Structure formats: structure tokens, C-alpha cells
Design a protein around this ligand. Structure first.
Ligand SMILES: *[C@@H]1O[C@H](CO)[C@@H](O[C@@H]2O[C@H](CO)[C@@H](O[C@@H]3O[C@H](CO)[C@@H](O)[C@H](O)[C@@H]3O)[C@H](O)[C@H]2NC(C)=O)[C@H](O)[C@H]1NC(C)=O
Ligand SMILES: *[C@@H]1O[C@H](CO)[C@@H](O[C@@H]2O[C@H](CO)[C@@H](O[C@@H]3O[C@H](CO)[C@@H](O)[C@H](O)[C@@H]3O)[C@H](O)[C@H]2NC(C)=O)[C@H](O)[C@H]1NC(C)=O
Ligand SMILES: *[C@@H]1O[C@H](CO)[C@@H](O[C@@H]2O[C@H](CO)[C@@H](O[C@@H]3O[C@H](CO)[C@@H](O)[C@H](O)[C@@H]3O)[C@H](O)[C@H]2NC(C)=O)[C@H](O)[C@H]1NC(C)=O
Ligand SMILES: *[C@@H]1O[C@H](CO)[C@@H](O[C@@H]2O[C@H](CO)[C@@H](O[C@@H]3O[C@H](CO)[C@@H](O)[C@H](O)[C@@H]3O)[C@H](O)[C@H]2NC(C)=O)[C@H](O)[C@H]1NC(C)=O
Ligand SMILES: *[C@H]1O[C@H](CO)[C@@H](O[C@@H]2O[C@H](CO)[C@@H](O[C@@H]3O[C@H](CO)[C@@H](O)[C@H](O)[C@@H]3O)[C@H](O)[C@H]2NC(C)=O)[C@H](O)[C@H]1NC(C)=O
Ligand SMILES: *[C@@H]1O[C@H](CO)[C@@H](O[C@@H]2O[C@H](CO)[C@@H](O)[C@H](O)[C@H]2NC(C)=O)[C@H](O)[C@H]1NC(C)=O
Ligand SMILES: *[C@@H]1O[C@H](CO)[C@@H](O[C@@H]2O[C@H](CO)[C@@H](O)[C@H](O)[C@H]2NC(C)=O)[C@H](O)[C@H]1NC(C)=O
Ligand code: NAG
Ligand code: NAG
Ligand code: CS
Lengths: 98, 194, 98, 179
């Protein structure tokens, strides 16, 4: 009981793939006079806490997802055009050193 | 009931109204406006929020400026119908200042390296186009500068570089910054001698 | 259509809302330089996602607080890990605010 | 219980799962992720008198471990101890008028997995405030001594010591006060 919850805290916080909202513009170093709609995409990324320091939760295998969204480029030259972009979707993670 | 997808440009001005052009065939049609995400529904209150059928749905831009997309929706006898999705786009345009560094007294010997920074400070949701003027035939490098937080500005940099100047490079150097609806510029005289 | 379907799905999944994250206890302020936490992290919900304007940030509008119990290792190893009770913020509603 | 892992990661570590029946088939579970380690007769064993013996590098990832045939959970703890330097800022020439505010920073730089205890010495209204500094295989610790309005008696040697558990480095500086 006293130890039931603690084990639950570990389990829930372990290194593993997690749904995050990735900012498209930043992920590809896109000039910010160029707007993405939506600005973000949902993908899974490795996250959580390792039990030593200098051990970081990293991806050991990655799938890639084609996603389509719209791109505005300001100062308004045109309306929004559809662009297809591939984002990393981590499928497995491990606490590794660096 | 409504005449692939559209676009709504919002001023972000917290009191100017915006019109979604959900045109109507039946001027006596009960139209609501859905926005997402999160999901909201706006009914005409007879005052600020209305639907003219000839114009479309009229609503204060601040009520839907959070949203990714909006659309008109009407019910007729237990069945509801939607217009085309409209993409919401909060653009800004306000340029505070455009400033050259160095700003004055620039003096080079022939063969020395000229470096001119042009910094533009703007409100949010602004994109900047830089345009230079200089004496006749220079590398340009534009980029974004980090700024905030809570500071309500964006900061843009354009850097002019001449690798080893010549007597012909003496003259007026002008940097202009354009947001789409507004342009501010600055300048400085560069002197060169042997 | 088919393109519109997914785009709407990207927005929905990336909207400002409470999300499960792993919070590093020590870094959440006021921790004695001689303490390690075990586990280092706790699972709580925090406001996250993407707003559609800039300068607007996903923030919490109401917060519950969770008592959680974990262990604290001190230095030197004079004693063993001792149980500590700590309260962490658990965001329960969020809004894109300036 | 607690299991301390050291820098020598090939060096073996012993989880003290004591046995009543010296002929007991014991496995070692670690989490998370979940792993189970069986004695291979070589590196990995269980002596009943000692407990379960395993190369520390096999379980250094884990939050906790336990013997199973289950014993009590053991908390896993990777610990460093190496302190690089301890440095005072300002470091010297400190000179105050009576009533002037003294602020002394003590910064300790250490290897990873280190915890620091600070201890000061000073002449006989001194406030201490310890905290962690962000960072590069290092950790950075700060301890700030503050005297809100000094007096003649505060003139003397100020010593900051940093302890990791197995190692202590210190630094000092003379503070002069005049009137
Ligand atoms: C784990 O996931 C990461 C992505 O989060 C993977 O790293 C990425 O790998 C791709 C291709 O290996 C890199 O694409 C490259 O982009 C650079 C320009 O940024 C370009 O120089 C290359 O030609 C290529 O187009 C991408 O940069 C990289 N992301 C980084 C560096 O953060 C990685 O492959 C995954 N690892 C495993 C083992 O699953
Ligand atoms: C990007 O990565 C995520 C996370 O790795 C992927 O989500 C994963 O989808 C697979 C395939 O459906 C799921 O596997 C399933 O596991 C359950 C047990 O819970 C099993 O009963 C099913 O038969 C199936 O094998 C998996 O749950 C899920 N992973 C996680 C951690 O949520 C996904 O493939 C990728 N995202 C997209 C949109 O492609
Ligand atoms: C949104 O959630 C944040 C936390 O994620 C809330 O901020 C917190 O507000 C409380 C006051 O209700 C602060 O309490 C603090 O108490 C400590 C002593 O225990 C004291 O040192 C602080 O001066 C303060 O009084 C707490 O610091 C603060 N959390 C942090 C670290 O920012 C906030 O209330 C939530 N906002 C809404 C509208 O729900
Ligand atoms: C920590 O934050 C999370 C996320 O904000 C909170 O989760 C929410 O917990 C409440 C229960 O107090 C759930 O309300 C329930 O909603 C369901 C339908 O969604 C309904 O059937 C129930 O009658 C009730 O209204 C809510 O769903 C849930 N949201 C989730 C899953 O994220 C949680 O309350 C916070 N922790 C504490 C102790 O307050
Ligand atoms: C307090 O004690 C520490 C050690 O715990 C003193 O260490 C200082 O370390 C620095 C960096 O290594 C030394 O700097 C030196 O720079 C020159 C470059 O040619 C050269 O002498 C060495 O290669 C070294 O890098 C520094 O000399 C050394 N101590 C002194 C006396 O300056 C720290 O300085 C002490 N703080 C005090 C008492 O102010
Ligand atoms: C060009 O640059 C100069 C600064 O180098 C700007 O000059 C400022 O102008 C305002 C009034 O317009 C004054 O209140 C400031 O004191 C001026 N600063 C200096 C140092 O003189 C000028 O604003 C810039 N031009 C534009 C269009 O931004
Ligand atoms: C001791 O360390 C603290 C934290 O780094 C220093 O506090 C900063 O002081 C500088 C200069 O006065 C300020 O610009 C910062 O805003 C301060 N930061 C904080 C968090 O207070 C302090 O200066 C250091 N003391 C000395 C003498 O080195
Ligand atoms: C905003 O402008 C309207 C006119 O369109 C005005 O009637 C109203 O008072 C203003 N909003 C506020 C702050 O009440
Ligand atoms: C140009 O701008 C950058 C970024 O602000 C700065 O580092 C550099 O010093 C600037 N050059 C001049 C001449 O001001
Ligand atoms: Cs942008």
C-alpha cells in the first residue's frame, strides 16, 4: 500500500514513446516569416525519466509519418498551400548515456 | 443552403468585426457559427453577432481568433447543414521601428569589410520582407531573433556584408522592412577612401 | 476532403489541454543540494499543446493538488531513503492566454 | 532496502536477499523496464548466505530490484562522488564598511550523480541559501552566504566546504571590515 503508489509513479514515468505536440516550423528550422496551419502535429516521441543522471531517454527505432497541412507565407504573397512533410514517430526507447 | 475550403483573415484588433462569407439561398435561415479547437458555437444575439445571408456571418474577431477553423451551420427540419471550412489566419502588420547598426559615421579604407545590421521590431504574427538600396555593383543574410517572453514583439535581422569595399561603395545605404501592409526604412551614409 | 479529415485531426490532437507528463521533482524548486529523489519523477497532468497565434501560451485556469509519497536520499549516506510527502500541481483546465 | 551502484560498472554488486533454504532457486527482477536475471553459474549467482550477486551494469538502469523464488524491494542508487573544484566569488580583496551587505558565492563543480552538502566557517545574522545550477559532464552547486549589514566582528576568514559523501574540497577568503 505504502509502496503500491511509488511503483505506480515509476511505471508511469518510465522512458517510453509518448504523444506530444511538435511545432512544425521549429522542428525544421523554418524561417518564422512562414506560417504553418496547424502550427503543430501529433506524433510520438521518447520521453520520461531515467534513474541515473547522464542517462537520457532516446529512440532506438523510428517510423516516419507523412502528414499534410497548410503553409502561409507572410507578407501575404498567396493563400495557404498544401504541403506534405514527414515527421519522426519514435516506436521504441531506451535510457542511454552520452 | 449555402452557395473546397476558404480563409478568414483576422486583425487581432480586439473590437473590429470579421465576416465569414457563408452565403445563403434562403434569407430566412437560422445560422450558427462553429469554431475549433476547442469547440465553440456562436449564435446571433441580434446585436454584435449576426447573419445577413447576403453578406454572411458577422462576429467580433476576438471570439474566434483562438480557432484553427470555422464554419457556418444551419438546421432545417431535424437535419443540419454546414458550409465549407474556413481556415483562420491571425496576421499582424505593425512595424515599430527599423534601425541600422552601425547607424552613422561609417568610414572604411579600400579593402576593408563592411558589415551593416538592419533590425526590425514588430508586433506578433508579422512576417518581414527586407529590401536594400546601395551604390552600384554584397551578401545579404536574413534571420529571426529571439525576443520575449511577455515582450509583445518580434525581432527581425538583415545583415549586409561587403567583403573588401571599393571607392564605388561610398554612398547611401537604405534598409526597408515590409510586413505586407506597412513599410518602414532607415539609412546611413558610408564613406570610403584610399 | 480526405486531406481536410486529417488536418482537423492534427488540430484536435494538438490543442491546448491538460496532458500527462513526467515532472522531475528535484527541479520543481527548493530542493536541498544534498538530496536525490526516488523516483526522480512523478506523473501529473499539465497544460500543453499549441495555440494558433504567437505570444499566446497554453496556461492552466484551474488547479487541483495531489499528495504523493516518495523516497528521498540524502548525502552523506548517514541514513537510508526516507519517505517524504509532497504536493504537486495537477492542472484540470487550460486556455490559450496572452 | 537500498543498493548502491558505483563507478566501476563491471564490478559486481550484491543484493542481500538472505535465504532460509540454501537450496533455493532465486531470480532477480528489475524495473522499469521489467527484466529477470537468472544465475548462470558464472557471473550471476545466489549464495543464500550472501544474497544475489550480479554485475552492476545489468541493473544500473533500474529504479528498483528484488529477489524472487518475493523479498523486500530494494531502491537502486547510482552515486558519484568526484568534486572538481570549489570556488569563492568574490575570491579576494573583499573590503566593507560597517553596515555594508556581504554576499559570498560558493560554487562546487562535480561529476554526475553527485549530491553536495555545504558547510561554512566564519568569525563568531548570516543567512545561507543553497541551490542547483543548470548546465558538460558536470553538475554545478551554489551556496550563497549573506550578511545583511556587517560589523567589525565579521572581519576574518570565511571558509566554504563541499562534501559529496566520500570527498570534500573547500576554499576560503579573508574579509576585511573597517570603521
Ligand atoms: C531517432 O529519432 C531521430 C528523429 O527525432 C532520428 O534523427 C533524425 O534522423 C534523420 C535521418 O537519419 C535526420 O535527417 C537529416 O536531416 C539533416 C538536416 O537536419 C540532414 O543533414 C540529413 O541529410 C538528413 O536529412 C534528422 O536530422 C535526425 N534528427 C535529428 C538529428 O535530431 C534518428 O534517426 C532516430 N534514431 C534511431 C536509432 O531510431
Ligand atoms: C507512432 O508510434 C506510436 C507509438 O509507438 C504507435 O502507436 C502504437 O500503435 C501500435 C499499433 O496499433 C499499438 O500496438 C498495439 O499494442 C496493443 C497492446 O496495447 C496490442 O494489443 C495491439 O495488437 C497492437 O499491437 C501500440 O499500442 C501503439 N503504441 C503506443 C505506445 O501507444 C503508432 O504506430 C505510430 N503512430 C501512428 C499514427 O502511426
Ligand atoms: C496554475 O498552476 C500553477 C502551478 O502549476 C499555480 O501556480 C501556483 O500558485 C500557488 C498559489 O496558489 C503558489 O503557491 C506557492 O506556495 C509556496 C509555499 O508552499 C510559496 O513559496 C509561493 O510563494 C506560492 O505562494 C505556487 O508557487 C504556484 N506554483 C508555481 C511554482 O508557479 C497556479 O495557481 C495555477 N493557476 C491557475 C489559475 O489555476
Ligand atoms: C488531474 O488532472 C486530470 C486532467 O485534468 C484530471 O482528470 C479528470 O478527472 C475527472 C474526475 O475528477 C474526470 O471527470 C470525469 O469525466 C468523465 C468523462 O470524461 C465523467 O464520466 C465523470 O462523471 C467525470 O466528470 C475527467 O474525465 C478527468 N480528465 C482526464 C481523464 O484527463 C484529474 O481530475 C486531476 N486529478 C485530480 C485528483 O483532481
Ligand atoms: C580555490 O581553490 C581552487 C581549487 O579548489 C583554486 O583553483 C584554481 O583553479 C584555476 C583553474 O585551474 C587555476 O587557474 C590557472 O590558470 C593558469 C593558466 O596558465 C595556470 O596557473 C593553471 O593552468 C590554472 O588553470 C588557479 O590557478 C587555481 N587557484 C588559484 C590560486 O588561482 C581556486 O583558484 C581557489 N580560489 C581562490 C582561493 O581564489
Ligand atoms: C532610424 O534610426 C534612428 C535611430 O538610429 C531612429 O531615430 C529615433 O527616432 C525617434 C523619433 O522618430 C526618436 O525619438 C529617437 O530618439 C531616435 N533615436 C535616435 C538615436 O536618434 C529612427 O526612428 C529610425 N527610423 C525608423 C523609421 O525607424
Ligand atoms: C552569486 O550568485 C548569484 C546567482 O548567480 C548572483 O545573483 C545575480 O547577480 C547578478 C549581478 O549582480 C545579477 O545580474 C543577477 O540578476 C543575479 N541573479 C540572481 C538569481 O539573483 C550573484 O551576483 C552572485 N554573487 C557574486 C558576488 O558573485
Ligand atoms: C468595442 O466597440 C464597440 C463598437 O463596435 C463598442 O460599442 C463597445 O463598447 C466596445 N467594447 C467594449 C469594451 O465595451
Ligand atoms: C549584428 O547583429 C547581431 C545580432 O544582434 C550581433 O551579434 C552583431 O554584433 C551585430 N553587428 C553589429 C555591427 O551591430
Ligand atoms: Cs511562424
Amino acid at each position: 500500500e505504502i509502496l503500491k503508489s511509488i511503483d505506480n509513479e515509476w511505471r508511469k514515468t518510465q522512458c517510453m514513446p509518448r504523444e506530444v505536440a511538435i511545432d512544425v516550423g521549429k522542428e525544421f528550422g523554418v524561417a518564422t516569416n512562414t506560417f504553418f496551419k496547424p502550427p503543430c502535429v501529433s506524433v510520438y516521441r521518447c520521453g520520461g525519466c531515467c534513474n541515473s543522471e547522464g542517462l537520457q531517454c532516446m529512440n532506438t527505432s523510428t517510423s516516419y509519418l507523412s502528414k499534410t497541412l497548410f503553409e502561409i507565407t507572410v507578407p501575404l504573397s498567396q493563400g495557404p498551400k498544401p504541403v506534405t512533410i514527414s515527421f519522426a514517430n519514435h516506436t521504441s526507447c531506451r535510457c542511454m548515456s552520452k | 443552403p449555402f452557395i473546397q475550403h476558404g480563409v478568414v483573415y483576422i486583425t487581432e484588433n480586439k473590437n473590429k468585426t470579421v465576416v465569414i462569407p457563408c452565403l445563403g439561398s434562403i434569407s430566412n435561415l437560422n445560422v450558427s457559427l462553429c469554431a475549433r479547437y476547442p469547440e465553440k458555437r456562436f449564435v446571433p444575439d441580434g446585436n454584435r453577432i449576426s447573419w445577413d445571408s447576403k453578406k454572411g456571418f458577422t462576429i467580433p474577431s476576438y471570439m474566434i481568433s483562438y480557432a484553427g477553423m470555422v464554419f457556418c451551420e444551419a438546421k432545417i427540419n431535424d437535419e443540419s447543414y454546414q458550409s465549407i471550412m474556413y481556415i483562420v489566419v491571425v496576421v499582424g502588420y505593425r512595424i515599430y521601428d527599423v534601425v541600422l547598426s552601425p547607424s552613422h559615421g561609417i568610414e572604411l579604407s579600400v579593402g576593408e569589410k563592411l558589415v551593416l545590421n538592419c533590425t526590425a521590431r514588430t508586433e506578433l504574427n508579422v512576417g518581414i520582407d527586407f529590401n536594400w538600396e546601395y551604390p552600384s555593383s554584397k551578401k545579404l543574410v536574413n534571420r529571426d531573433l529571439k525576443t520575449q517572453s511577455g515582450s509583445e514583439m518580434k525581432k527581425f535581422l538583415s545583415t549586409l556584408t561587403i567583403d573588401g569595399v571599393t571607392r564605388s561603395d561610398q554612398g547611401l545605404y537604405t534598409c526597408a522592412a515590409s510586413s505586407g501592409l506597412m513599410t518602414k526604412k532607415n539609412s546611413t551614409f558610408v564613406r570610403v577612401h584610399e
